[PDB]
Amino acid sequence: VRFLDGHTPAYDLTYNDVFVVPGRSDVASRFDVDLSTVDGSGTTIPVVVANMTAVAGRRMAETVARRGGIVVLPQDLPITAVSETVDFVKSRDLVVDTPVTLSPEDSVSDANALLHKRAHGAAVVVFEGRPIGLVTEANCAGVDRFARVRDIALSDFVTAPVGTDPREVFDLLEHAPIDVAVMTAPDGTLAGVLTRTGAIRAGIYTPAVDAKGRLRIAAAVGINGDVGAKAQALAEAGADLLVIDTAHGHQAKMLDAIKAVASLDLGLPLVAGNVVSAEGTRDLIEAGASIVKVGVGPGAMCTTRMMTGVGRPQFSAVVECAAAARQLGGHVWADGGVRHPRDVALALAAGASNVMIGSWFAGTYESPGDLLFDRDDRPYKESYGMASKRAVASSFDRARKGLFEEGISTSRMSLDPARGGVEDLLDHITSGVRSTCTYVGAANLPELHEKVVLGVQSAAGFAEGHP
Amino acid sequence: VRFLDGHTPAYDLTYNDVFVVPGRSDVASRFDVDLSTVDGSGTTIPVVVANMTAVAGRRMAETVARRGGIVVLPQDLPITAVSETVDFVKSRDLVVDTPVTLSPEDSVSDANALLHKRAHGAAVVVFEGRPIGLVTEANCAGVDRFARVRDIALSDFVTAPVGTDPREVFDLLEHAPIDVAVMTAPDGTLAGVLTRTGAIRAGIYTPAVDAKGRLRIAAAVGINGDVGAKAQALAEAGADLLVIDTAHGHQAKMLDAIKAVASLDLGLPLVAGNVVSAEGTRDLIEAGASIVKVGVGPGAMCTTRMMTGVGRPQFSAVVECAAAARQLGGHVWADGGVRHPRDVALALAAGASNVMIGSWFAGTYESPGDLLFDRDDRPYKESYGMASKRAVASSFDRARKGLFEEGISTSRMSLDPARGGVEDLLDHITSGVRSTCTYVGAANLPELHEKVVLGVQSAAGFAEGHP
Amino acid sequence: VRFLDGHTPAYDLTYNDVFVVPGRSDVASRFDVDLSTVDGSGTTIPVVVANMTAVAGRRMAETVARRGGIVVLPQDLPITAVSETVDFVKSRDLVVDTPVTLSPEDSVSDANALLHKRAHGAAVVVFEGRPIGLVTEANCAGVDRFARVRDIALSDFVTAPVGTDPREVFDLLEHAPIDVAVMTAPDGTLAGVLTRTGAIRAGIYTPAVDAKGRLRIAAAVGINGDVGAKAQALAEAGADLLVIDTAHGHQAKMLDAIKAVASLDLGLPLVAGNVVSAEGTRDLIEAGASIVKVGVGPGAMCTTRMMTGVGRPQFSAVVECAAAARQLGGHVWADGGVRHPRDVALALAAGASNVMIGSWFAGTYESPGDLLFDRDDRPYKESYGMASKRAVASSFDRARKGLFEEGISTSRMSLDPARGGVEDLLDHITSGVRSTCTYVGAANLPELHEKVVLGVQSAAGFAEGHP
Ligand SMILES: Nc1nc2c(ncn2[C@@H]2O[C@H](COP(=O)(O)O)[C@@H](O)[C@H]2O)c(=O)[nH]1
Ligand SMILES: Nc1nc2c(ncn2[C@@H]2O[C@H](COP(=O)(O)O)[C@@H](O)[C@H]2O)c(=O)[nH]1
Ligand SMILES: Nc1nc2c(ncn2[C@@H]2O[C@H](COP(=O)(O)O)[C@@H](O)[C@H]2O)c(=O)[nH]1
Ligand SMILES: Nc1nc2c(ncn2[C@@H]2O[C@H](COP(=O)(O)O)[C@@H](O)[C@H]2O)c(=O)[nH]1
Ligand SMILES: Nc1nc2c(ncn2[C@@H]2O[C@H](COP(=O)(O)O)[C@@H](O)[C@H]2O)c(=O)[nH]1
């Protein structure tokens, strides 16, 4: 990638150590740039939710797929749950979000705990398939925790049929006391709930769909055990994309797994990682992988940097691997070390065909975890590492292996008190990437890579601007 | 610009990463150097107040214009208010500051809130155009908040006619209980209020005036909409200098706006920004701009560095753009990243024809904002970013554009408990620049640029000295 | 008064040391008892606002007079202000409260400070005598403190003509976003503002009015100086009731003042105090006083107990003086030591024809003081003692008298965060007195005195019940 004159630092650079120099721009507005990825994963935004059990669930899968990004299901997961999640996601409206359906016999405690499963802020009490009420934080508060939800003073909702343009439902919700509105099927059954900002987003983002027009989804497999059988069963389960993940993506087991999956000829794009070296990417590409995950160590839950000293600063690894893959025709997914939208913008600028968010999305409403509360009542969630799920594998043998195994690290990802949903994190990331495109003057991601110029900055250079 | 031998860092440098090496000096004192700018903006000190609605007002405009610096009025402002502000500023005494005029029927609360509008520390109660009393924090305290100001125990004031030299009013205020003194017109009407330190400053600073001897003022326009009509109407409104500001100053819209304004042949100097590249400055100069604003990202209210990764360390961008502009004959205004007078001194040293302060001046008495108080009772003010006012542009369209728009960032700029007025910040900045001139040994700003030698310093190098 | 068998304590009892034993009751509800006073002061509730400059103002006067209680104007007040206040009060609607009238040219700071003058929670912006807008804490917040009130985003109000029954305006305000409603004169000019709870209270309370149907008001004079001339001028000023107040109501100066006022034959009822002895009440009654204030020392602002050791527990003094006055046909006002409605109920039970609240009402919205805020942002107000205004009287003489004079004590009366208005304190007091009537079984205040039975309780007896 192009660098400023005289910029040959004697160290690998991270995201905080680099910056983008704006160039001559012809892109008028942020909406004039398209974020469609070229990697073949079919994501209209360069965002992938990581294959972490704390960040990858059915709700996040459907939400991000509707917003145009693919979601990788966590590895080492019972294929029954995988099939259930895939069937759930593929049966979702391309525009309307699936609400928190509440049976009239549910308790107040269950309703209150479920209200935070989604970012809508309200839950639908539905009887016999017909929506009969709405609950929120207001009517639920004060009443007894174990009273039935049929006696929670159900509020009135704005009902509209499925197929009305986002304009009409938007103006319908201009003065609505409750932001959400129930999209009902023509027969009268509830089909979903659409929000004011959801109506806004329905036009900006184009949902990522497969050849059959269903929300794309992905799943991950390890290398321990029969990789071929697991990958084949995953492909038959309906997963659009297969991701083979391990702590070290340059070992012979990784190459054998990629070779087996490629020989299976499943037709789905191939994703392997992680390698932070050009030779590792070359080996993975020659092994039969179309997409290469890059980054071992920058992950916010990754510990190997402190325990082993291995790793690489994310930006330099991403740019070198992207150069290698583009030399061999392959494509690159940056993984780990993403905490600000500048990280996404720089990862795409370095040459990566896509970026993968990880534990940042764990601090969202839709992450498959428990929304706990701290002492100061600030919302947050616990993010865990994959640990043995990303590692190559009687009571004695189990405990002996577990003694030397890296512990499951835990972190507290705080929720935004106002913009807590993953919708708003995606909005921030996409706005940052669009602004980067406008500053560079690129109409698309390949043009972003081609026309970006990057400079090096010191520690004090990062202090410039408002945090 | 000249650098120390062996100093070729592989990264763009910010203000904290550079230092000035003193050379052989013939300038005896700080008062022996003149800070007159060469850019044609006619500012006798190298200080410009930014085109921010939280830092650019009529009071700051008149104060800084009297002290020798130009003020850029915020963009996207009703031309009626622009004309009112320009007429107010052009009708100000070149020596005497306009006080807080208080009608006798004003309440105690209004008087107390108005007392902090200016740095004088006292407000003038004037009846029928004749000054009849003075109020301050002492007599106002304790009395009922809604009692009339005619019953606030008005104090006695030192009255002097307009035209007395600062020497005489200075010695008149040597033992005065109230620091301020009322300069009255020959007919007896109140013309202004002059302070002890104001008398001191009346000789050190030479006010910036136009060809008609009136306090210079500037105004800003965006690129969205008809730039030519807005610029022409601004020129007819009486603005001395036109500033065309946008988030990205290298886009085609910027060039078209500069071309239109230059074709208008208004005669005022042309200011465009922001570009942090030599090619951007070349394009702006060829587009018909005499002065180029440089710096996108270092701004204390700017967020694009964290959201998009775009930007550049301020010092390297300023020096490169200054070199380019001086190659093409243009002149440079550094913008953003100014928090200490060393930043101003380094910006002028890098080659910029002027520096623009920004949110630092928002924490002053004269900034067009509300002087709020924190829990610890330390005075402070809220500084906001321009956001869409610096960005290129039905309810649906409005909300859709606002969803992706960067939020209006807010910061708390604390007031100096003693030297809170913008007069004292200007004193600090000018003292720092004069000391830099003496250390370099330069009699003027062009000599500052010519004879300055700059070295590179590490993180621990910045720790040297008293903070 | 009747006491329980065997209750002959060897100490004077205060309110905390006594309790009422309920008897056989025929009063069904609290609304079945009338609180009309027999003293001739014409107050329909047994509440009098004290002659304290921190608790007695025009707003409190009109409010309490509309609610059925008389207000004594503070002594040592310029008769011009007395006449202005009396004319203001006598020109008030018997049902509608006078709102915070706001001229369109007032500032935001003035509007915000004025909003807390009344308990309505909203202020009326009126132009040319016609109401044009409403302001509250919501629209006022966030906007600049010195912006004009014509640009404070005036809200819509419910307008009704004067004369509509409280039922109609009550149902009109059932779903109103703003609790208050503007009662307008038939010509369209604004006549007042009536609230939802104000509509509720318009039927429960019967306003205290004179023979001409105007809100009754009272004023106070001291004993120093010509008492006769001051009392006569006060009577001509329109004051319905005259109160002669001093620290010691048994001195010869008190008797001479009462004799002079009685010889004036002004026709208004006579109020003198304070005496806590039967002989003092006898002397005051024989001096030509119809009503006797009792209580010197129990006052929450009174200091003489700690400085001099003089005083008396309020309950025993009140009962003894009431017995003496009823023996001579006079009537009694308890003064001081009122902090809970039980104090009012016990004062009326002891035999006092009325009770006088004092500094408790100083912590209200309508008290003539400044609503200050503490560090924890809890609303409160400063209550001051009368000091020399209740004491018998060159720079040397002034300072010599002031050296030995008791200092003006200050106390912090906290505002109720929800029920801060004096309307709600009056509601609490009246509810307590009505409940006491029901528990005793009395249909009126004379029956309360006749049929009440009081017992003595120890320190631990006061701990019973919820505080
Ligand atoms: N009643 C009800 N429970 C729900 C709904 N959505 C999620 N849940 C709860 O959440 C569980 C799954 O959590 P998830 O893996 O989706 O975060 C379900 O088994 C169920 O207990 C809903 O719409 N209604
Ligand atoms: N070595 C290691 N890497 C992990 C673990 N958990 C997650 N990761 C890596 O870190 C990524 C997420 O980090 P993030 O992008 O949130 O900073 C995952 O996609 C995966 O590549 C773990 O327990 N160990
Ligand atoms: N009465 C009075 N108000 C003033 C004076 N200077 C500023 N103000 C207030 O401040 C407002 C403008 O604030 P600025 O934009 O000057 O910071 C005016 O509309 C007025 O309310 C003055 O001398 N007298
Ligand atoms: N991108 C961006 N730049 C801003 C915004 N507000 C101010 N700026 C820039 O930052 C400068 C002030 O920053 P300062 O000099 O106070 O650090 C302004 O003159 C302008 O160039 C904003 O909202 N967004
Ligand atoms: N503009 C305005 N000021 C009021 C109003 N009511 C009270 N005030 C203010 O309050 C002062 C008197 O306070 P008070 O003695 O009534 O508590 C008045 O002189 C005036 O400053 C009102 O309706 N409008």
Ligand SMILES: Nc1nc2c(ncn2[C@@H]2O[C@H](COP(=O)(O)O)[C@@H](O)[C@H]2O)c(=O)[nH]1
């Ligand atoms: N001795 C004395 N009594 C006072 C003073 N201020 C108020 N009082 C008395 O205390 C009463 C109010 O007390 P409260 O009823 O609020 O406890 C007044 O009506 C008056 O009788 C003062 O400064 N000194």
